[PDB]
């Protein structure tokens, strides 16, 4: 039934400065010569309080997909700090990697991300306004969350 199956996601360049682009090595399997494109997205949760502060870092259309095992590195630019509420800038947040077929999301891989200052003085006495040039992004890559959804694969 499910034409596409995500086998693995590897977090590359981690930890890294806040401004470095995200890099995930994704491996997936395709059952047939999939008729429509697969739409991969990297979504950054800018604020746990509201979905309005989500930033879609990149949206990619992969296809035609021939039947078989495939692997690619999904790279996406770091979020725009100008849209992140200061209260949510430092500490834990989530980055999501989703895939969508025919406008239906079928997989969501989430990673908890902890943004922290690297200097001891800044860790103990954080600036009034976050300094994204001094933040390090530490993705909690040993604990990924995978959620699969039932979609209509028929054409």
């Amino acid at each position: 039934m499910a034409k596409v199956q995500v086998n693995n996601v590897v977090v590359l360049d981690n930890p890294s400065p806040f401004y470095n682009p995200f890099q995930f090595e994704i491996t997936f399997e395709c059952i047939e010569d999939l008729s429509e494109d697969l739409e991969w997205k990297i979504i950054y949760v800018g604020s746990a309080e509201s979905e309005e502060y989500d930033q879609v870092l990149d949206s990619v259309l992969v296809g035609p997909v021939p039947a078989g095992r495939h692997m690619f590195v999904f790279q996406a630019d770091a979020p725009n700090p100008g849209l992140i509420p200061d209260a949510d800038a430092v500490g834990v947040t989530v980055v999501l990697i989703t895939c969508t077929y025919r406008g239906q999301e079928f997989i969501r891989v989430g990673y908890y991300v902890n943004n922290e200052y690297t200097e001891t003085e800044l860790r103990e006495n954080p600036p009034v306004k976050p300094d994204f040039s001094k933040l390090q992004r530490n993705i909690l890559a040993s604990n990924p969350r995978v959620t699969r959804f039932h979609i209509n694969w028929e054409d």
Binding site: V45, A48, E49, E51, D88, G91, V92, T93, V94, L96, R108, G110, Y112, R145, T147
Partner: peptide, 11 residues
């Protein structure tokens, strides 16, 4: 409440 909200987002 931040952890509960973030957990709902991943689900």
């Amino acid at each position: 409440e931040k952890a509960a909200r973030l957990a709902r987002r991943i689900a």
